[PDB]
Amino acid sequence: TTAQQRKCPEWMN
Amino acid sequence: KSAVVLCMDVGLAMSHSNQGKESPFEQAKKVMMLFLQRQVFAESKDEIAVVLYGTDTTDNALAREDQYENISVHRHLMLPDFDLLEQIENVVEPGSVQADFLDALIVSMDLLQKETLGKKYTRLHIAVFSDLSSPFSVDQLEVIIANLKKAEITLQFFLPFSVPGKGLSDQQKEGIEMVRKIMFSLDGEEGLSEVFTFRDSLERLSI
Numbered sequence A: 001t002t003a004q005q006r007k008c009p010e011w012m013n
Numbered sequence B: 001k002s003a004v005v006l007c008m009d010v011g012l013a014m015s016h017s018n019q020g021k022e023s024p025f026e027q028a029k030k031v032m033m034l035f036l037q038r039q040v041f042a043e044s045k046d047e048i049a050v051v052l053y054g055t056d057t058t059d060n061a062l063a064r065e066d067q068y069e070n071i072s073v074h075r076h077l078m079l080p081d082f083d084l085l086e087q088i089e090n091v092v093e094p095g096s097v098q099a100d101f102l103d104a105l106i107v108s109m110d111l112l113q114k115e116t117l118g119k120k121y122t123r124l125h126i127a128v129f130s131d132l133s134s135p136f137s138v139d140q141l142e143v144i145i146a147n148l149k150k151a152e153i154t155l156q157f158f159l160p161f162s163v164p165g166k167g168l169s170d171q172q173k174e175g176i177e178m179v180r181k182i183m184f185s186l187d188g189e190e191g192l193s194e195v196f197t198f199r200d201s202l203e204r205l206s207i
Helices: B024-041 B082-090 B100-117 B140-151 B170-194 B198-206
Strands: B001-007 B047-053 B071-080 B123-130 B153-159 B195-197
Touching: B001 B024, B001 B198, B024 B047, B024 B082, B024 B123, B024 B198, B047 B100, B071 B082, B071 B100, B100 B123, B100 B140, B123 B198, B140 B170, B153 B170, B153 B198, B170 B195, B195 B198
Parallel strands: B001 B047, B001 B123, B123 B153, B153 B195
Antiparallel strands: B047 B071
């Protein structure tokens, strides 16, 4: 388990 | 009609055979075929997609430069058919890598968001099949939960063991606790009931 960053798609904002 | 995503782990660890003659990969593939056969034979109107994580190649709308890697959309949201039955049984094989299940959950939610636009469903549903042995990142999990709630998605987790001990690894134990936190956020005390075994999976999917 980590915390490597991810980008969610814009619609989930 | 309802909309369903089957989100299946095919990473390398699922191929390890130490619980009977069928590996977890084989068992989950079998449940998926029986469910899809029921749907085809009853001429159900529900639409069913299939997302695989742990695949050697990458094929999904979010894959970009070291992101959402080793995740493949095998079947988009459609009525199930006989070609899908043939593909699952002959094409779909174990991967030689591992992938991030929260990446896969986001790919599944994005699929439902886009492909249900402008239509009416009785329910939206995601069913996850995994042994939880692969590492994952928790970044943005609070955004995942908020959108599960807004979209009124029902979520179900299926595991090849119940939760004498089973020799679960620390990574598996961390995955189980994360599943508990997700389900309690959505449905409270009763939410923890929506965590099941492969053994009970076919009947719970169907109700």
